[PDB]
Structure formats: structure tokens, C-alpha cells
Structure 1
Amino acid sequence: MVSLPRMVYPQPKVLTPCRKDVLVVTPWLAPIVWEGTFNIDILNEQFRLQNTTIGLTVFAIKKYVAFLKLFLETAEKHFMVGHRVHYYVFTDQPAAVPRVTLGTGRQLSVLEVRCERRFLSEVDYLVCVDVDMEFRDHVGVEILTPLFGTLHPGFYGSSREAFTYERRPQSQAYIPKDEGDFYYLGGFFGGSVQEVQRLTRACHQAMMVDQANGIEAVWHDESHLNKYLLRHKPTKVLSPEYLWDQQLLGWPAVLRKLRFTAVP
């Protein structure tokens, strides 16, 4: 918006692809975020000049409160470092939330559960993730955009017919075998506050319609998220570097970094 300052960095090479092993842009021209595609210094400048605030939301119900300490401590080392961050922890056990030391410009709010406009006034972007995870490497502003989904680590190389989308036409989440771009994760999505609220509102309404008709999608919210992103294309797609399970899937050559991973 304001001009970027002078910066010294390698010149982009028009005749050299960033990657010869993976797709780095979708058919609707949204970038697919892989290591080796972005210069983080340029992106950090762009987002800091806008004084960007990122909200990170997690739910920790019942036994999942045990995952909060590692989740938050590692987020402090790797998530949006240098930028304003507001953590929102939705839990049924407020007194069980660990006291984690936060860097400057970062804050945490504990919301007890069994608001909407609140997010609009407190943050610019919302990132919604699973709590039984830990950050192991950089997760930064390269992911920010109006609406993003993340490629599920178990299906990124799969054909659409093999995707575990909801296949019963009676469900609002129904996707037939000849449709679908990717299989996105329910555990890592986000975007501007406005777009995230539109997505969550749509999934809530679709799930209510299914409940009324006596049907529950095969993968619950994730099935609905996939239907939403099929019909409302995300403006960025995150590669599986952003949500990986090393125990189950190892460390493939196509992954130069494992950024956020499942906890055993």
C-alpha cells in the first residue's frame, strides 16, 4: 500500500521454474504454497506495513486441553513471528489452560464453551487449526489471503475418484466422482475474518439441513468444508508442509520442510 523500501535479494528468474516436482498454481490462478516459491522478506514487509493482526483459533475440549502447552509454546517459536497475533482458546476447562510465556505483541484469550463481531474488530485474518499438533518450522504471512484451504497429507497425490468426499446425493456435502480439485483438511483453514465467517456459516447451515434429513456426512465438518471450497475457490492453497503426520507418512522428497505436525 505504502511503498516498500529498497531491498536486496536474488532476482526472480523468468526462465527457471520454482519447482519441477509439484504444481505451484491452481487452475484459477491461486498460488499453492510450497517452500521454494516465496521470498519471506518481501512478504513480511508487505504485511508489516499494513500492521496485520492474525487470530489463531483452537478448541481444547475435555482431554484435548493436554495439548495446549506444546501447541502454544511451539506457535511462539514458529507462527507469524514478528507480527501481531491473538490466540483464541475455546475450552470447557478455563482453569486448565497452561500459563505460556508470550513474545511481545502477542496475546491470548480464553473463551469458555459448553463474539462474532468481536473477530471483525480484533484481527485482520483468522487461522483455524487442530490443537493436537506442534509447530516445527516457519508458518508465516505467506499463507494469508482472503480464503485458504490446506492439501490433506494423506491424499495430495490421489485422483479425485479416490477422495473420501461425501458421496450420497442426499447430503448437502455431496460431490460426485467427476468433480473436485483437491481434498482439503478440516484441521487447517483460514482467510480474512469476513471469508472465514462466511465459510463457517455455510457449513453450519448445511450441517443443520443434513441433520434435519437424518444424515451425517462421512467426514463431518471436513466433508462440508470440501464442498464449500469446491464451489468457492480458495485464493491460496497450502501444501502438505502445513499439516503433516510424520509417524504415518514419513518425510517424502516433495516436502522440503515439515512445518506443523501431528503429535503422537
Structure 2
Amino acid sequence: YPQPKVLTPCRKDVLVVTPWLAPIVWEGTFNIDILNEQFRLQNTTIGLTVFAIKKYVAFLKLFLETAEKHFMVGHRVHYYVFTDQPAAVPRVTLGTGRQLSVLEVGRRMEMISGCERRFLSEVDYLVCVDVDMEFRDHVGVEILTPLFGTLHPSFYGSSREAFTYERRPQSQAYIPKDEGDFYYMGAFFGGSVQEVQRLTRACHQAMMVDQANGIEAVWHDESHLNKYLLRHKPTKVLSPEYLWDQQLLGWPAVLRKLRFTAVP
């Protein structure tokens, strides 16, 4: 493969590492051939969780079809579809080493943390995404790490005081005006099974505390996710390539690939 050269950076236009030395994942920062080999040597299995409740079942077909084309191809994958309509889950043909389970539900942080023993035995990593999305380009093992969050596409150019963090100190999700690294979106986070269960257990415990206190955070689980990732910093951060809306935000030059996008 091409020899990396220490005096020529590959991307000079964007921050590629956080101040706590976590990679920020942009096209041009990674050689996928190297990463794929490292992960295949461990026989890595990746869990992908998706909720499709009520009308949101309609999003599953495209979601799964497109995951088959772009998500962890070559690796073992277990889709977990949480739904109130198990008969509405479309039958999508999967690649080898890939499987899907339908979990019937009667919330997300709760539901993710007691499927607890199940995830620990079956997968190495867990990835938690919104269903009303499609994959348009490669989303692979470059994202895998103990704990990651994703930069919210509306706020990646913003200063922290503009971040729509929870601001009432009454709320467990509270983050002061002069604190904060990034604004992460709740639509795409993950990590090791152990780290995702810690995060979701913490968010769940914090939401219950707010509830028993008569307050709900301004952006609900996304508020608590941001407070967690402030105090427990992610080991990788995904760039907005991994969570975008072309309709609302177009295709700027700084995004070489649009990998996982909102469905119009």
C-alpha cells in the first residue's frame, strides 16, 4: 500500500484527531485494507440495532437493503430489529455471515440495556442508529472502537454556546455554557458491547432521575448522550460523512463521501 509520509498530511482541511487523541473519521484518514485485515483476524461480529415502531416499519426495506450493500461488508453482522409489528419486517436477502433477529416490543436506551446478556454473547460491537436512513457509501470497521459518537451535521461548524445541550441545572443532562467538546447526534453511536451497555444504562438511569423530578431534557436521549460523552470521552468520533441530510445541507466540498443519510 501507499507509504504514509509524516510531513505530508492526507487531510489538512479538517481536524482528524480530538484533543484527547481520538481519531475523527474522515475519508482519506484510513486505509481500509489494513483495518479490514486487523478486524477479520479477530473474527469480529458487529451488532446493528434499529427501532421500527408504528409507521417507521416502512423505512426498514431500504435501510436493510442498503446496509447489505455498504455496512461492514465482509464481516459478520447481526441486525437487531426492535418492532411492534414483527409481521411487517421485510424479508431481505442477506450476504453470508449476516443475520437478522426481530425483537418484539410493547425506551431505546432502556430497550438496548435488558437485551443485556443477549448482546454480550452474540456480538463484539454494537452500533445503534435511526431507521429512517439509508446507506449510500462505505460504513465499515474504521468506526469500530470502545466508544464512539457522531458529529451532528447541523452543528459541526458551531461554537459551543450555540450547542443545544440541556441547559437547566435541574436536569441530569445539564452541561454549563462554557463546557463541551462537540455536539453528538443521538442517531448514530456505538462501541464495544460493554461500553454501549454502560452508556445506555447511564442514560436510562439519568432519564429516570429527570422523570421522577418533573423535567424532560430538551432533546431527550440525545441530551443525556451528550452529557455522557462529555464525561466519558469517545475513543473515536465519526465525521458528518456518517450522518447527513443532503436535502437540508447539500454536498459540501469538505464531505468527500455521503455514507449514511436521511431519507427525504
**TM-score of the superposed pair, with normalisation by structure 1:** 0.96
Q: In the alignment, is residue 14 of structure 1 matched against residue 6 of structure 2? A: yes
1:229-240 matches, within 5 Å, as 229-240=229-240
CA distance in structure 2 between the partners assigned to 1:134 and 1:225 by the alignment: 23
* Backbone CA RMSD of aligned residues: 0.4
The C-alpha deviation readout for 1:30-49, integer Å capped at 9, x for no partner, is 00000000000000000000
The C-alpha deviation readout for 1:221-264, integer Å capped at 9, x for no partner, is 00000000000000000000001000000001110000000001
CA distance in structure 1 between the partners assigned to 2:57 and 2:243 by the alignment: 20
Q: In the alignment, is residue 110 of structure 1 matched against residue 102 of structure 2? A: yes
Matched residue pairs, number?
255
CA distance in structure 2 between the partners assigned to 1:128 and 1:206 by the alignment: 19
SS at match of 1:20: coil
CA distance in structure 1 between the partners assigned to 2:254 and 2:167 by the alignment: 30
Q: Which of these residues, 39, 47, 53, is aligned with residue 47 of structure 1?
A: 39
- In structure 2, the residue matched to 1:59 is 51
CA distance in structure 2 between the partners assigned to 1:247 and 1:21 by the alignment: 24
The C-alpha deviation readout for 1:24-77, integer Å capped at 9, x for no partner, is 000000000000000000000000000000000000000000000000000000
CA distance in structure 2 between the partners assigned to 1:10 and 1:35 by the alignment: 15
The C-alpha deviation readout for 1:164-194, integer Å capped at 9, x for no partner, is 0000010000001100000001000000000
CA distance in structure 1 between the partners assigned to 2:215 and 2:8 by the alignment: 50
TM-superposed deviation, 1:18: 1.9
CA distance in structure 2 between the partners assigned to 1:254 and 1:154 by the alignment: 14
TM-superposed deviation, 1:20: 1.2
1:114-153 matches, within 5 Å, as 115-153=115-153
The C-alpha deviation readout for 1:100-127, integer Å capped at 9, x for no partner, is 00001000000000x3101000000000
SS at match of 1:54: strand
TM-superposed deviation, 1:206: 0.3
The C-alpha deviation readout for 1:203-232, integer Å capped at 9, x for no partner, is 000000000110000000000000000000
TM-superposed deviation, 1:17: 1.2
- In structure 1, the residue matched to 2:110 is none
SS at match of 2:148: strand
**TM-score of the superposed pair, with normalisation by structure 2:** 0.96
| Stretches of 4+ aligned residues off by more than 6 angstroms | none
CA distance in structure 1 between the partners assigned to 2:242 and 2:200 by the alignment: 21
SS at match of 2:180: coil
SS at match of 1:128: strand
SS at match of 2:247: helix
Consecutive unaligned residues in structure 1, runs of 5 or more? 1-8
